[PDB]
Amino acid sequence: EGTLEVAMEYRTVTGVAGPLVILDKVKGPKYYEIVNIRLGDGTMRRGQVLEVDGEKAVVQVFEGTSGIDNKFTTVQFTGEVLKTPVSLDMLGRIFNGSGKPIDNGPPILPEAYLDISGSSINPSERTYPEEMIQTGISTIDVMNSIARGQKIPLFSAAGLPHNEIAAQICRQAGLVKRLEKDGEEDNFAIVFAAMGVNMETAQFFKRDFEENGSMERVTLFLNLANDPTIERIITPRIALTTAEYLAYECGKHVLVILTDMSSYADALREVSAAREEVPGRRGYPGYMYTDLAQIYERAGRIEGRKGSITQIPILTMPNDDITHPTPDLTGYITEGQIYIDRQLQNRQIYPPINVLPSLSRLMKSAIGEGMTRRDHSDVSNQLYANYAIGKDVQAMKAVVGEEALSSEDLLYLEFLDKFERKFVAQGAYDSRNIFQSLDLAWTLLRIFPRELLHRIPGKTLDQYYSR
Amino acid sequence: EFQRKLAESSGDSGANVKRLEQETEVKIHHLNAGAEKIQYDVVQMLLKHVTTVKN
Amino acid sequence: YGYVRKVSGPVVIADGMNGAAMYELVRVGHDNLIGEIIRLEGDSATIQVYEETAGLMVNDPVLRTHKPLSVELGPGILGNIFDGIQRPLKTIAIRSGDVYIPRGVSVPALDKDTLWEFQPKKIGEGDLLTGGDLYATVFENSLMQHHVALPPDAMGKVTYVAPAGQYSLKDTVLELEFQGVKKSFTMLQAWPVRTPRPVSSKLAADTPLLTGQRVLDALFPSVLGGTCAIPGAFGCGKTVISQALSKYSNSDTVVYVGCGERGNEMAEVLMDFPQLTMTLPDGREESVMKRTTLVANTSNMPVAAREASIYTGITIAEYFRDMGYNVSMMADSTSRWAEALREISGRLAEMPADSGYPAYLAARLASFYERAGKVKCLGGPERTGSVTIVGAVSPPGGDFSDPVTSATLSIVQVFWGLDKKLAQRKHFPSVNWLISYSKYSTALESFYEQFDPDFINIRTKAREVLQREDDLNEIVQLVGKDALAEGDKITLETAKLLREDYLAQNAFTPYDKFCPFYKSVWMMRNIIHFYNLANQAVEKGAGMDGQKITYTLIKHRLGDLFYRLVSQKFEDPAEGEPALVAKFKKLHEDLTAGFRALEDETR
Amino acid sequence: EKQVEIRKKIEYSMQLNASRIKVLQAQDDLVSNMMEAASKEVLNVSRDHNSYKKLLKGLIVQSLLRLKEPAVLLRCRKDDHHLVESVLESAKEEYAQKLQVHPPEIIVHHNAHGPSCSGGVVVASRDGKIVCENTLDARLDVVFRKKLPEIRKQLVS
């Protein structure tokens, strides 16, 4: 505070293996101190100190390690942790992985520097997700709904249109309370962070956001596949810090779309392997759970502020499974799971969301008579049961023949057909009102007689079984 | 009707562009005035921080 | 004293320790982070930091404390929320206006300035007192009294006991003299987090848990001081069972220590339990926050804090059992705890074992679980109290081959194995009755006999019916119900009725919010009596047909009794036992009228 | 017609983005003017010859205390080299007073050109492995970086 000290500059780069440069004969080395590397050519890269030991210190480099020499490579210890500048002007701009602006504009003029991995929120100050946001997609709205401050990861496999449905959610997300909801603060101020994305996907998201008229609202941090791998382990943290500043300290509802968390697990694997650490499941680092918790638990409404953070981190299973460590840990941590199945895609339904594997822990809070129809929970719990039992019936009929099925079996099969065709499918640009979705669900349910509707209570039946 | 609608849209777009240009000019003027007002104090503070050493 | 050498993740190697014993808590850096020793190599000692390690220097001072991980006990421990290292969260949020938890905050675990009322238990001057003797009682809050006891490592003659009145923890409420020297005692009591509290002798449990849910309390019971394990499932499980064990259980208090779980779920729990007006007393609606305690440590919390959270939770259980209450501790952790062990073991460069988990995982889980069990307390008066450990296991997506699951099942006595298939079908209590078990079924013989001398037989009959149905489900999956005879058909009808009436429960309505034992046993007896009478009728074969013809006869001309049986779940418990018992006795009489009236005209 | 009006809305949004980007770029240009003025003032500070020596002594003391190395090799501009040569052993005496250590064996030769230096010293250690750049131009752009949020907070209007 009194007087400053200009950062030291070294040259003792005694070891360079992969993405790690191993400095030596260093003094006063901070942990996670951000370093500046000036090569012999004069280009400047930026790195981080993964480990400090005695006089040595191991430094990973974001922009790669394609030119370091033991003689000329200068490294400089800034003596501080990462601090991404943040300002209200950060809305409506597109950025590189580490925060450098790529919109041909000027660099951010900061309102303040906020250290990455922001300060932990005391649980005695959080509040449960109260309000519900309308996702547009009917399957999400009727079962597995999303409340403000939720963490819903979309589970997908290679080739499925997870990016398309993410864009649809970004275009269609909005409040639901009594169908009443300018709303500039109600505008979700989407912060999109893409890691390891094919350039076609980045162009697609850019064009969709530009066309939807949200270019003055959304914000993009991109870490393309050709871009250096290490920046993928910083980009989501930068995005979450920016979201935290835009929501908690500015009072804007914020929505976050982390893309290809498997492309983040890959960065974790590369870093862990480069350090010769003890591996975990499938060779992933033993602390992948801690990192995923640190990257997910930074969303949720806060009591003292009017803001909120609701993130939808999409995920790509490697071989289309769940036992893989990354989707498994994500399911452990996150409060939801939306499943996109290859079977539905093979049958050509644009939203391939398999409603049976789906789950939302906070579903019972978002719905209710105060903000939804009183029958919403009943309707959902019945459709789920009939779909599950009908699927069992279809599996049985696959071996016993269509003739051996009973009348209830035929009813269940017809319910499955109309559910997978008329209900799940929805337009790529057409939304569905929550009440319209419930009306469609009731039309699907009314195939069965009143006797078979075991889950639905008679009180809700009387007001809805006829309509 | 369509020709009238497109003509009205073009007129509204021109009006919005002119309003944006005027607002931009006003903003630039305000920022330049503030910078001119506060430049000397800013530079004095910067030099005071630079030109001090402790121990 | 000592200085840092190496900083990698949460593992810090500080040189110059020399005489620094294992697990001797040390304080690291200028920010003064808490931290426990994990390994030694000479003048240097490994430390776990329990906090973010970003910003540690080299030659940054580390101070030793000579004390292992210790949690501060005493009045006011109930109804609070503590971090894994036992920091009062609400105190931090109020004392510092910042909504965040600042790095390296130093706040006492219990407030040292609140005025507490002191009621000495007739202890006279010059009297002799000993470890755990209960010399004074303090009403921490209404409907939950807090006895004050001497620490187990204390004894002496009572030279001075404070009089009744308002006291604070900084004051000396009692004085003792022993072996020619005197010692003082305050209302605080610090205890190492490990090294469980001493017990005069353990005991064999006899009282059941009698939890709210019908399946748990009837099919797979647990005893007070028992040991359970659910697979930490959501929607079901971690929410409905937690609510039942917290607000609808006979345990005198609750200790929720669920760590390593979602932050939104923790906020929901911590915002819903404040109201939670459970009728724990006979005629009072006191909120259960005057009865429970949270040791919440979210997933984003430092990896090294999971074990600390678990052990502080079980230590708090012990303080209450020692006073006399039958505490029941629920741990949504032990799924993230195994991950914490893997993280620390790998970082400490330990050699992994089967499936990568540390070889000593079973030892740690045993050292945790075996602190359960009802126990005859220390000191005077004679007393008894118990601790229940209803832990968590990996969700039903992995088989029992999981090392954490195998280790738990090698120790845990009662397994409430929830199945994901039931969760898909939206069966909300979701206990799979084929794979669950309860080794306590033999000790509860006395209680079952005294409550109802015929419950064991009806329970065995229900188990046989369920097993028979699950057995012939495969045969039906091949051939179909065409070949099913009268006995098979009636068995499947009774199994379906049991599955949808008995084994289900909504828990969001007064019909199934809390099912007392009498109502559950009456449902079981009614269903089993119907099954037995129907089997006898179809075995009679009167009217030259009997059999499946008689089955259709009782399902059509006698189906009103069947509908009343399947609707018996809706008997409102608020009507009281003398009313519901009469209603069920009338239904039983009507059922006995059937299968005799049906046999009157020989079908 | 729908896509025409959608394209018109997109064009309006693009124009709004262009206007706001122009405003932001003008803001950055003003910040650059501020930095240029600060650099000019820093250069003007070198005109002094009495307090300038005290500042140089303070800078060399700070750097030598930060290195805490047995043998540094200070490098100073050819202009005002006389001032450094005059202060000489005063810095060594101050450092030896700071802690019970033998006086460093400083060495002072090649100098960078004035505008590159603009005052300040580069101290470094033997073999140049560890370098401390206490140039005035180096003290600036660090104070600037730290105080930039305060600058924006000062630029309310």
Side-chain angles (χ1 to χ4, degrees), chain A residues 2-4 6-8 10-23 26-32 34-37 39-40 42-43 45-52 54 57-62 64-68 70 72-79 81-88 91-95 97-99 101-102 105-110 112-114 116-121 123-124 126-127 129 132-140 142-143 145-162 165-167 169-170 172-176 179 183 188-197 201-202 204-206 209 213-214 217-222 224-226 228-230 232-248 250-259 261-265 267-269 271-275 277-280 282-287 289-290 292-296 298-302 304-305 307-316 318 321-327 329-334 336 338-340 342 344-345 349-353 355-362 365-368 370 372 376-377 379-380 383-385 387-388 390 393 395 398-402 404 410-413 415-416 418-419 423-425 427-429 431-432 434-435 437-438 440-450 453-458 460-461 465-466, chain B residues 3-4 6-7 11 14-15 28-31 33-35 38 40 42-43 45-47 49-53, chain C residues 1-14 16-17 19-23 25-33 35 37 40 42 44-50 53-58 61-66 68-71 73-82 84 87-89 91-94 96-97 99-100 102 104-112 114-118 120 123-124 126-127 130-132 134-139 141-142 146-152 154-169 171-178 180-181 184-196 198-201 203-205 207-209 211-216 218-233 235-237 239-242 244-246 248-261 263 266-267 269-270 273-274 277 279 281 283-285 287-293 295-296 298-300 302-306 308-317 319-321 323-329 331 334 337-342 344-347 349 352-353 355-369 371-374 377-381 384-398 400-401 403-418 422-425 427-438 440-444 446-448 450-451 453 455-460 462-463 465-468 472 475-476 478-480 483 485 487 490-492 494-495 497-499 501-504 507-511 514-517 519-523 525-535 537-538 541-543 546 551-554 556 558-567 569-570 573-574 576-582 584 587-588 592-595 597 601-602, chain D residues 3-5 13 16 18 20-21 23-27 30-34 37-38 45 48-52 55-56 58-67 70-73 76 81 84 86-87 90-91 96 99 101 103-104 106-110 112-126 128-134 136 138-140 142-146 148-149 151 155-157:
Chain A
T3 60
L4 74 163
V6 192
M8 286 316 267
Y10 299 68
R11 286 208 295 98
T12 55
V13 188
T14 191
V16 181
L20 308 182
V21 292
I22 321 298
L23 305 176
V26 187
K27 60 185 58 181
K30 299 293 291 294
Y31 180 95
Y32 279 170
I34 301 314
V35 298
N36 308 334
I37 287 162
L39 294 99
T43 58
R45 293 185 168 101
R46 197 160 69 178
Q48 195 164 359
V49 175
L50 289 175
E51 171 210 283
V52 171
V58 169
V59 163
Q60 66 181 357
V61 184
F62 297 172
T65 53
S66 306
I68 297 89
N70 315 121
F72 311 148
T73 307
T74 301
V75 64
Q76 170 189 156
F77 273 70
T78 60
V81 295
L82 274 175
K83 301 180 188 290
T84 184
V86 288
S87 70
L88 183 63
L91 289 182
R93 303 196 69 187
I94 181 167
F95 292 83
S98 62
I102 68 180
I108 291 174
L109 171 68
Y113 304 90
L114 304 188
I116 316 306
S117 68
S119 305
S120 182
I121 304 162
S124 58
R126 281 180 182 267
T127 66
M132 182 179 72
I133 71 183
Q134 193 167 241
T135 47
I137 313 300
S138 182
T139 47
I140 309 301
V142 189
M143 296 106 16
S145 183
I146 294 174
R148 190 132 59 244
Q150 185 84 295
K151 302 176 291 296
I152 297 291
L154 316 185
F155 277 28
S156 68
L160 316 179
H162 54 255
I165 62 170
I169 292 162
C170 291
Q172 292 157 355
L175 295 97
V176 70
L179 293 164
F188 272 71
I190 302 178
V191 170
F192 172 39
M195 319 169 285
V197 285
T201 309
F204 181 76
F205 272 107
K206 187 188 290 184
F209 283 133
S214 71
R217 194 180 71 202
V218 76
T219 300
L220 279 77
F221 306 155
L222 304 188
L224 318 170
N226 54 4
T229 69
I230 310 302
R232 306 208 299 237
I233 210 168
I234 298 89
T235 285
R237 299 190 193 294
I238 301 299
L240 282 158
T241 304
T242 54
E244 274 182 25
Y245 173 72
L246 283 166
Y248 295 157
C250 184
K252 311 185 73 81
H253 296 301
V254 169
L255 183 136
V256 178
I257 310 291
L258 304 180
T259 293
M261 294 299 291
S262 193
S263 172
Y264 181 95
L268 279 171
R269 180 128 52 73
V271 170
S272 71
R275 295 185 71 193
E277 267 177 22
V278 180
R282 204 141 311 171
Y284 283 82
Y287 58 88
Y289 176 92
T290 79
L292 294 184
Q294 207 169 351
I295 193 168
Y296 293 143
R298 292 173 67 180
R301 299 178 79 257
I302 188 165
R305 288 84 184 267
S308 62
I309 299 170
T310 304
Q311 65 183 177
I312 310 297
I314 77 181
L315 197 153
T316 308
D321 59 353
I322 300 93
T323 66
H324 187 82
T326 304
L329 298 169
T330 295
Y332 273 80
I333 298 149
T334 54
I338 298 313
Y339 191 82
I340 297 89
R342 298 217 75 102
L344 265 288
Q345 193 34 70
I349 296 89
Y350 157 71
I353 297 160
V355 317
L356 206 52
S358 291
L359 212 125
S360 176
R361 272 92 181 270
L362 271 297
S365 183
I367 65 172
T372 51
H376 186 291
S377 58
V379 155
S380 131
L383 283 157
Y384 238 84
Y387 180 76
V393 165
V399 65
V400 301
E402 281 322 288
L410 301 172
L411 291 184
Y412 276 27
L413 297 196
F415 167 75
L416 294 175
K418 296 153 221 173
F419 187 81
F423 184 77
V424 177
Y429 284 77
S431 76
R432 295 204 186 145
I434 176 67
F435 288 88
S437 300
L438 286 168
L440 268 72
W442 263 119
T443 61
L444 267 294
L445 287 171
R446 71 184 67 257
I447 283 174
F448 303 136
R450 184 186 293 267
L453 294 192
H454 308 110
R455 310 239 169 238
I456 336 212
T460 68
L461 284 169
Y465 192 72
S466 65
Chain B
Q3 312 320 305
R4 193 271 302 141
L6 62 83
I28 308 307
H29 153 271
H30 302 329
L31 294 174
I38 206 160
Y40 177 70
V42 173
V43 164
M45 183 177 176
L46 267 288
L47 266 293
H49 287 76
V50 172
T51 56
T52 179
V53 296
Chain C
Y1 207 104
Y3 61 93
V4 177
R5 212 171 41 81
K6 181 182 172 103
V7 184
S8 161
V11 169
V12 168
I13 318 306
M17 281 325 98
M22 281 215 67
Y23 300 106
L25 267 285
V26 301
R27 201 175 314 284
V28 183
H30 302 283
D31 63 358
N32 287 313
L33 303 176
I37 297 170
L40 279 78
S44 69
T46 304
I47 308 152
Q48 293 179 356
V49 184
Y50 296 163
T53 53
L56 292 183
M57 272 273 284
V58 168
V62 177
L63 269 72
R64 193 170 67 264
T65 71
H66 318 93
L69 183 57
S70 58
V71 65
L73 276 60
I77 191 80
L78 281 163
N80 267 10
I81 304 96
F82 299 121
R87 292 97 57 89
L89 269 173
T91 308
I92 291 170
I94 285 169
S96 62
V99 73
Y100 317 106
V105 63
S106 179
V107 58
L110 298 186
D111 173 273
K112 314 282 201 63
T114 310
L115 275 298
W116 296 97
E117 72 276 33
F118 185 86
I123 299 307
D127 208 353
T130 191
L134 294 156
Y135 58 96
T137 180
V138 177
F139 308 99
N141 50 56
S142 57
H146 177 107
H147 308 73
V148 182
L150 293 167
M155 62 225 78
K157 293 187 286 185
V158 184
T159 77
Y160 163 52
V161 61
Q166 295 319 106
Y167 272 65
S168 55
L169 314 187
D171 286 9
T172 303
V173 286
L174 184 137
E175 186 75 6
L176 287 182
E177 190 277 334
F178 177 81
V181 69
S184 294
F185 302 93
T186 66
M187 294 177 71
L188 194 85
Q189 170 189 332
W191 181 253
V193 70
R194 303 168 167 89
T195 313
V199 159
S200 68
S201 59
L203 290 171
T207 301
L209 196 67
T211 181
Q213 302 320 111
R214 189 156 52 257
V215 172
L216 281 67
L219 281 187
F220 306 106
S222 57
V223 299
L224 270 170
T227 285
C228 314
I230 63 170
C236 312
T239 310
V240 72
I241 310 301
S242 63
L245 182 59
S246 56
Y248 306 120
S249 52
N250 58 0
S251 54
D252 291 331
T253 179
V254 189
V255 177
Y256 188 98
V257 305
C259 75
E261 61 185 308
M266 184 57 62
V269 160
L270 162 67
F273 273 110
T277 46
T279 182
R284 292 168 44 72
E285 291 325 280
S287 53
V288 301
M289 289 330 268
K290 313 171 79 166
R291 204 172 84 144
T292 188
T293 298
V295 183
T298 61
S299 297
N300 75 299
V303 62
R306 307 288 210 284
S309 171
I310 300 299
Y311 280 114
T312 55
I314 186 53
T315 290
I316 296 307
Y319 191 24
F320 298 154
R321 142 177 64 64
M323 307 195 298
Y325 301 103
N326 287 320
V327 5
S328 283
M329 181 255 268
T334 68
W337 190 27
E339 294 294 328
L341 278 71
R342 280 208 294 123
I344 52 186
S345 162
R347 283 187 141 127
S355 305
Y357 287 93
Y360 49 76
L361 172 63
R364 317 303 276 262
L365 287 175
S367 83
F368 167 52
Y369 276 97
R371 306 173 52 152
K374 84 188 283 194
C377 308
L378 261 63
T384 259
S386 90
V387 165
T388 312
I389 310 297
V390 184
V393 191
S394 71
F400 298 156
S401 64
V404 64
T405 303
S406 74
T408 43
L409 271 72
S410 74
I411 294 155
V412 168
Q413 278 272 104
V414 169
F415 179 38
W416 293 327
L418 311 180
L422 286 166
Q424 302 309 103
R425 211 205 89 223
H427 185 257
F428 294 111
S430 75
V431 181
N432 177 305
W433 55 85
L434 305 176
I435 73 194
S436 302
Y437 59 87
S438 59
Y440 285 120
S441 72
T442 175
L444 287 172
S446 311
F447 172 88
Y448 286 162
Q450 63 84 30
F451 184 79
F455 167 72
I456 301 101
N457 274 349
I458 71 173
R459 203 200 41 211
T460 49
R463 291 300 283 272
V465 163
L466 291 172
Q467 171 52 54
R468 174 51 200 231
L472 66 85
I475 295 89
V476 171
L478 170 66
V479 169
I490 192 55
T491 292
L492 276 296
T494 52
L497 190 139
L498 199 75
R499 197 198 311 114
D501 186 74
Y502 201 102
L503 308 182
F508 298 112
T509 182
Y511 320 132
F514 163 77
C515 168
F517 191 45
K519 178 168 90 154
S520 160
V521 72
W522 265 125
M523 303 195 207
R525 185 139 65 198
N526 293 353
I527 302 164
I528 293 304
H529 202 64
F530 162 93
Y531 166 85
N532 196 0
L533 287 183
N535 181 278
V538 302
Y551 162 60
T552 52
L553 176 140
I554 67 168
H556 187 273
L558 206 61
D560 75 21
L561 293 184
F562 189 92
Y563 173 72
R564 285 211 292 151
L565 280 160
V566 74
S567 58
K569 62 206 306 288
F570 293 124
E577 285 290 344
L580 295 191
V581 161
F584 290 141
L587 188 153
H588 189 273
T592 50
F595 316 118
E601 71 276 40
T602 67
Chain D
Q3 63 84 30
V4 170
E5 81 206 58
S13 87
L16 182 63
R20 78 188 213 80
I21 286 296
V23 169
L24 181 61
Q25 182 59 45
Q27 179 146 268
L30 295 179
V31 170
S32 304
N33 296 115
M34 295 299 102
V45 172
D48 182 286
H49 204 76
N50 53 21
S51 69
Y52 184 91
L55 178 60
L56 265 291
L59 282 164
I60 192 66
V61 159
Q62 162 187 58
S63 196
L64 195 149
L65 262 67
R66 189 143 50 81
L67 280 72
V72 308
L73 80 172
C76 169
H81 235 157
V84 143
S86 65
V87 301
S90 74
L99 73 165
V101 70
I106 194 169
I107 306 127
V108 174
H109 159 277
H110 155 261
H113 71 84
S116 73
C117 296
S118 305
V121 289
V122 192
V123 179
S125 165
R126 299 313 308 295
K129 287 309 198 39
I130 309 102
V131 166
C132 199
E133 183 178 1
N134 300 83
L136 267 295
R139 288 186 93 75
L140 192 64
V142 178
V143 178
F144 193 95
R145 196 216 305 289
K146 291 174 71 175
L148 194 50
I151 304 300
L155 192 58
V156 294
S157 280

